[PDB]
Amino acid sequence: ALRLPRFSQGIAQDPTTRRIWFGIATAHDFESHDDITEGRLYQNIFASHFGQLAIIFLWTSGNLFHVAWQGNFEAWVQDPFHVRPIAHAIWDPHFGQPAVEAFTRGGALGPVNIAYSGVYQWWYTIGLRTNEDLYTGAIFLLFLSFISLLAGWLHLQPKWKPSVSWFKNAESRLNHHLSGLFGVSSLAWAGHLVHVAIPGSRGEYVRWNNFLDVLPYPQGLGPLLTGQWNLYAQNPSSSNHLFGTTQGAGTAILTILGGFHPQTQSLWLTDMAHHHLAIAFLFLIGGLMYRTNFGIGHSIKYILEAHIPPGGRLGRGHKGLYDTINNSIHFQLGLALASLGVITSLVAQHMYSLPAYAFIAQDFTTQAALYTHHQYIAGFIMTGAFAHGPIFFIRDYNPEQNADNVLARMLEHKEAIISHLSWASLFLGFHTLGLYVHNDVMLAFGTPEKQILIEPIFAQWIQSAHGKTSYGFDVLLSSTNGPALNAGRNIWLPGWLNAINENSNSLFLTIGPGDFLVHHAIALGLHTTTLILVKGALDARGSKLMPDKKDFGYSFPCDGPGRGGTCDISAWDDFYLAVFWMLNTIGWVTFYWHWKHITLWRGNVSQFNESSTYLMGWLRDYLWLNSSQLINGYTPLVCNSLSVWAWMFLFGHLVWATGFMFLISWRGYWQELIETLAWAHERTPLANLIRWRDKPVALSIVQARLVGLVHFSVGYIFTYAAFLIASTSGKF
Amino acid sequence: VYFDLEDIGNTTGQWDLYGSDAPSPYSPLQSKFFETFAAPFTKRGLLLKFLILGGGSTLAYFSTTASGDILPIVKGPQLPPKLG
């Protein structure tokens, strides 16, 4: 130990400044710590988990507190369409007098920030109405954040620490997470909806003071246990219903109308209560599949052992795969992140098309913000999923214990996997760029008729199957003589068909040749990023250039200049490479989303449809066009309320380019520079009275790529965010 | 110029170059005035605390103010886009 970082003796004996740097970036890599055991590993993680939950609870508690104390909300509830939600108050002594004037918006008393996360629509939909509601909610989360720390501390104590085999009790945890964590939680959420949320949308306020001697339904729980549940869908809210009031209010608490509430343009509250109630069943019954202490259930191991196709085309199938996953926390994290990354994108693609919060669709900046938010989160999560996959292969993978099972066969034919991913990327790349450039030349030579505009009829055919009238086609749900139509006839379909064919909402938007090209760009982005990541994973343990890439670990600088040169040959380094491509991919996705939507909100889908087929159009009619109000945030003539976004816009450019230094220039140059400065300090009078305690050295080879990538990423995210918010909110 | 194991210090240029070694040029009493009045700040630790707590609250104290910028002031707020 002796000094920081004392989870690693060998790194504390570093006489340079590298000990501090590396002491921070390895603080959570518990397995690399000194005297680590499997016992301390699971205990440290378990404790960190409570710490994380504590921060989450505390974080949301802050938002609630500040919205209540510095935000209107109550003013917003009366006029959702015509009140800007307030994030919080601005207190900055650097503010000049103009900035204080320009920023005091939303009917506040001083300069404030306008929220674009959409918590206002969420809490209004949820049932929250006044500030008092928000405070008690903030108190409750502050409380939950305390008992998180309290529980984290408790299981670090010797008489409450759980054994490793307790953590490896998979079937018990799954039986409880499915049944309790997913099911009961969802069940009880539908409870909040029919008690507070739904009656709140009908003018009656149901809080803790009066939720006992007040019925959610006239027949009141009678029909549920009777079996005639249909009574709860007997009288839904009217089509002329107004949210928060009794005008048009029904009595139903569980429906399946489909489509949107006309006023709020959001999903019916009675559709969502029903949704979670139905969900909770498949989850409650689902969490009784695996075996515990009652003599019934499944052995997850025994299932995997039993799934070997005869004729051995998958070898030994999934045998031994139970222990391979249950012993390796990285395999579990990889599976967790991949799954979580997919439903993170699923959330993004569903919340813009099928809004669940009242009056959230009208707020275009919030809708743009939230979509871009999750698609980058999902993107980052996806690369991490493909990072611990490699880590698993290096640290936990046991070749003999996975002999000839599906996992081993992956490595066995890794060249085939990688080469085809390379072919798919090359195919998509050559033609998507090819078609874009061809069209740009046609526009250049002033002959747009010569363009190659391929109609996306496959996807148009899908939309027709959903019931979209455009394109014709006479597909299912688009045809009067369709068994699928007459089956759902007058259930969810009238609401659905009405919504899918409304021209305002983002429910299955019309797509054309311009949509065709960007999607292949997207396809290109996905295939390449995966190609990089899985080539990294499958080569983590070695290659022809470096047969023993294991023994060296996940992250190492290289293997020297011999054998041709081996820079960026570690599995950590292709992660590093893949992040760039994932940033490029999500960038294409959010460019696509935001341009399609601003033209829609502007009533000018023509501009997108005619300019998205050639790349000059993207530069001129999307980026150059919408940058107008942004870059005029401050001017030689004045400053606006968009000045902060203009400043951040450059800030992003600065951080981004600053990262280019760490990525382009490498270490040997800076090491030789610093040692000349080491000379200077010692030979300068009055200055050599002061001596450094840590020897100044250049950042390491890997550290450089990390620092560079962080800048590149921070710049990336901060630049687009400055543009996304300003161009949108400047126009709305 | 030289090289003796006997005297490494001198061998490796450990010289107090521009050192004075001269007697104090400061007039006495003046020194004694400064030696008795600056004495409390010479204890360390306590100086660290005096500067944090002192510097912290002294800073807080200038919380109070006027011609800083505490005045959105009588200026009709704009709407100013779709409105709000």
Partner: peptide
Amino acid sequence: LPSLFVPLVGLLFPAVAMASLFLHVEKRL
């Protein structure tokens, strides 16, 4: 005016934090 928690978070906490970290980091048990 509670908005005078800003300097505390804004400056005081950071200074204390930095000083402390600096000391812990240079410590030689």
